[PDB]
């Protein structure tokens, strides 16, 4: 049956870092001494992971409630758990967690894992009560309290063998995905010591099972082992040393990754092609180490943030133009324009070109329209391609430092993406003190009057170098 | 097993033959390899253009 526990009271979260964890073998291929580039669902490097304690002893004298909130499941979950007494037992997967929608129960009880995909009537607080005997302390009695009723299953797995029930903490990491009706569970196990949060390190995850589910999952829940008595909750020590066991949750995200396979075919290192400029250059060169110089990584273009339509001020259902509403007109901003059916993108400006009374367009190069006349308010306005360029990454060698500078070629940088609040690194703070050069806008490097035999050639007589504590500077080269 | 499992006649090695392993077709000489596949892997590609290794369904050689 089901037994009610005290209300969760919506405890405020506490967060922690995920230092480069959660890289699993994406495919079923063997590679050796190859640096292979992949794109899939991964946990981003250096991400927020929210961590819950098993039993929150809120009062110093003792509180003995469970922390098992229902959390969203958005295209996969990285779930790590550190414990020393086997306190978490399993997970509940579903969409509504009632009798209306099918649900997966993966909890193990004392005997086996009992993977059960059925229609469960789940209660509010699921758990498995384990009681040490207060006298003999030899038999640990276990009683599940998960589902009131289970009906008409589409799957079942059981395990025949039985499994047995002060700082020897152990770390179990899992990744759950749902692709093409297949529930993929990847797993990994590792001993640890004297690390309360997620330790610094890397660990590839080996696929464990691909379960043919074919249902939807959107929410999931964690089931815990209740050491104490709900009928008679004790004052203290009823739980396991104040809910020491803990579990961390993070959400995957579509990302590319440069993945390093060693000689044995075991993944050992990884690199985010969307974390900071150095990593983008690493992915572009298809190597983990880069030498000093200037590398062109990608291209930058301003996107049109709105659309405008100007249709003639006559009904007539070109004069047979279809039914569409002519919106207002904007200027000095890269927009998508549609003038009398003529579509394009650009920035519009007031034009001084004296149009003759019968002319409509204007073209200087014979394949691009330069100016235009608005059909409703007949004013001449010219069109310019708003912006575009290439992004180069000034860097000294990867031995020296991981500081870089970014140069947008041949563009003003009163319009480079700034003050931002996906790799949204841009600047979002003018603490770099960008400054224009004839070659474009250079962001992240200092200006210095001193002149030296310039090492990294930038352009227009400007070269950059790494100087001593130490950072990047840009200066006009001297000839000696 | 599922659907209709078929047969393969025999297997020959050290001999340039036309081979079809689980639908992967080609020509080549098959030889015993000392590479150690991980338990969940099927084929390998050290060159990034051609699968230089393959796992035999009958015997995991």
């Amino acid at each position, epitope marked *: 049956q089901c037994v009610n526990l005290t209300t969760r009271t919506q405890l405020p979260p506490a967060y922690t870092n995920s230092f480069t964890r959660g890289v699993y073998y994406p495919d079923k291929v063997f590679r050796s001494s190859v640096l292979h580039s992949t794109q899939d669902l991964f946990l981003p490097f250096f991400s927020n992971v929210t961590w819950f304690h098993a039993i929150h002893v809120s009062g110093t004298n003792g509180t003995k409630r469970f922390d098992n909130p229902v959390l969203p499941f958005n295209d996969g979950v990285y779930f790590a758990s550190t414990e020393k007494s*086997n306190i978490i*037992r*399993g997970w509940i997967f579903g969409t509504t967690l009632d009798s209306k929608t099918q649900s997966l129960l*993966i909890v*193990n009880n004392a005997t*086996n*894992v009992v993977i059960k995909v059925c229609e469960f009537q789940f209660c509010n607080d699921p758990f498995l009560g384990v009681y040490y005997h207060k006298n003999n302390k030899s038999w640990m009695e276990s009683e599940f309290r998960v589902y009131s009723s289970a009906n008409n299953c589409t799957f079942e*797995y059981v*395990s*025949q*063998p039985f*499994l047995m029930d002060g700082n020897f903490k152990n770390l*179990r990491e899992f990744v759950f995905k749902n692709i093409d009706g297949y529930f993929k569970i990847y*797993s990994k*196990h590792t001993p640890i010591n004297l690390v309360r949060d997620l330790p610094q390190g890397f660990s590839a995850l080996e696929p*464990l*099972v691909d379960l043919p589910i074919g249902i939807n999952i959107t929410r999931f829940q964690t089931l815990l082992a209740l050491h104490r008595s709900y009928l008679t909750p004790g004052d203290s020590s009823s739980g396991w040393t104040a809910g020491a066991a803990a579990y961390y949750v993070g959400y995957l995200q579509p990302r590319t990754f440069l993945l390093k396979y060693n000689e044995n075919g075991t993944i050992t290192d990884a690199v985010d092609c969307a974390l900071d400029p150095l990593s983008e250059t690493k992915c572009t060169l298809k190597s983990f180490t880069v030498e000093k110089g200037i590398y062109q990584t990608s291209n930058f273009r301003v996107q049109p943030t709105e659309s405008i339509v100007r249709f003639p001020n006559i009904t007539n259902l070109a004069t047979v133009c279809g039914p569409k509403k002519s919106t207002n007109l904007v200027k000095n901003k890269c927009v998508n324009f549609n003038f009398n059916g003529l579509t394009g993108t650009g920035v519009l400006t007031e034009s001084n070109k004296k149009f003759l009374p019968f002319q409509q367009f204007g073209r200087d190069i014979a394949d691009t329209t330069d100016a235009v006349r608005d059909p409703q308010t007949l004013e001449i306005l010219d069109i310019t391609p708003c912006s575009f360029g290439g992004v180069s990454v000034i860097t000294p060698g990867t031995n020296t430092s991981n500081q870089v500078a970014v140069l947008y070629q041949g563009v003003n940088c009163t319009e480079v993406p700034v003050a931002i609040h996906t790799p949204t690194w841009r600047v979002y703070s003018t603490g770099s003190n960008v400054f224009q050069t004839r070659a474009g806008c250079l962001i992240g490097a200092e200006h210095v009057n001193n002149s030296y035999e310039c090492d990294i050639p930038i352009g227009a007589g400007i070269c950059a170098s790494y100087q001593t504590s130490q950072s990047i500077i840009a200066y006009t080269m001297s000839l000696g | 097993t599922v659907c209709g499992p078929k047969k393969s006649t025999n297997l020959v090695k050290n001999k340039c033959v036309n081979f079809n392993f689980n639908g992967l077709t080609g020509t080549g000489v098959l030889t015993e390899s000392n590479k*150690k*596949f*991980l*338990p*969940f892997q099927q084929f390998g590609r050290d060159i990034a253009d051609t699968t230089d290794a393959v796992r035999d*369904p009958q*015997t*995991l050689e």
Partner: nanobody
Amino acid sequence: VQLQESGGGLVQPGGSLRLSCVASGSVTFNSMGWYRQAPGKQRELVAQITAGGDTHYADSVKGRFTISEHRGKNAVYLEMHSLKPEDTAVYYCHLQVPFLGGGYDYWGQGTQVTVSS
């Protein structure tokens, strides 16, 4: 899929054989198991070897079956001898891969063996 295991020859009462678990690669384990099952009856636990060396055996197979391991090719062998018609069944080898404390063993790959005159 993961591992694989099949093959074995028919024998007559009093014969001998050495069943072998097909080398599937390096895999983490702590107990290699051998089950036996025939139609009309349940699977039964026959022979267990622990990574440490514990040798569990059913009462019906005492003194006739020998279980051993070879880590060079990572295969566990069961020598079956002094055979009787009660051994007509399929034999299944189950692995130990830990899951959530332990689960999903790998007995699905089996071999059919019939002991008759």
